[PDB]
């Protein structure tokens, strides 16, 4: 209403798809930073492989080099199945990476709207039923098309570049990327309503993003030390 912002909508809207009570709740940019957390990690990974060369690849004959490198990574469209737990680590490092920056912002000073985030004395909601919706963010399909729209154009990623003729080159990696975004939110939000509620708060506590990501990486590490 105040201003357009597809990004915030991705997290805000998806989170709003849950309990109707959040039909008009504008939490602090903390939840927004969470969105960027998922993007920040993927951005580095994507940038690490794509490289400015992939962007201007067409212009640069290098269209066949760092490009094939990006193809040798995540090029395989396989779903988690314990194929290599030792490797799932590196992927977890990326998730933890975004968890670190969130640890720093974990002290954000509500510079915008004000809801029961940490103070627990403000509520910007219409009202509904008090329960753990946990509608699973995997339901993120309302307006997620905006994510790919700006996610790619922003990086102008050419990907494998030398498609060779596949064409279907694109859509595979971006699809899996969205997959992790769903599970990321799913675990985070479900934990948000659970932990945020136990915190006599019905909003988005940075503790959820930090604590949620913490337990996720812990289980993935296959340890509990």
From Swiss-Prot:
Subcellular location: Nucleus
Source organism superkingdom: Eukaryota
Residue ranges of the TM segments: none
Complex formation: Interacts with YTA7.
Known function: Centromeric protein that plays a central role in the incorporation and maintenance of histone H3-like variant CENPA at centromeres.
Record's miscellaneous remark: Present with 556 molecules/cell in log phase SD medium.
Protein name: Protein SCM3
Source species of the chain: Saccharomyces cerevisiae (strain ATCC 204508 / S288c) (Baker's yeast)
Upper classification of the organism: Eukaryota, Fungi, Dikarya, Ascomycota, Saccharomycotina
Recorded name of the encoding gene: SCM3
């Amino acid at each position: 209403l105040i201003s357009k912002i597809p990004f915030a909508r991705l997290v805000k809207e998806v989170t709003d798809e849950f309990t109707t009570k959040d039909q008009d709740l504008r939490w602090q940019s903390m939840a927004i930073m969470a969105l960027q957390e998922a993007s920040e990690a993927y951005l580095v990974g994507l940038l690490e492989h794509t490289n400015l060369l992939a962007l201007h690849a067409k212009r640069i004959t290098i269209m066949k080099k760092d490009m094939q490198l990006a193809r040798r990574i995540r090029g395989q469209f396989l779903v988690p199945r314990g194929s290599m737990e030792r490797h799932k680590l590196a992927d977890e490092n990326m998730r933890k990476v975004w968890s670190n920056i969130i640890s720093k912002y974990e002290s954000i000073e509500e510079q915008g709207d004000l809801v029961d985030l940490k103070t627990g004395e403000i509520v910007e909601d219409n009202g509904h039923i008090k329960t753990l919706t946990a509608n699973n963010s995997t339901k993120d399909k309302r307006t997620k098309y905006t994510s790919v729209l700006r996610d790619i154009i922003d990086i102008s990623d050419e990907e494998d570049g030398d498609k060779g003729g596949v064409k279907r080159i694109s859509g595979l990696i971006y699809e899996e990327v969205r997959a992790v975004l769903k599970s990321f939110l799913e675990s985070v939000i479900r934990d948000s309503v659970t932990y945020t509620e136990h915190a006599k708060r019905k909003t988005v506590t940075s503790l959820d993003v930090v604590y949620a990501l913490k337990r996720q990486g812990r289980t993935l590490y296959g340890f509990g030390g």
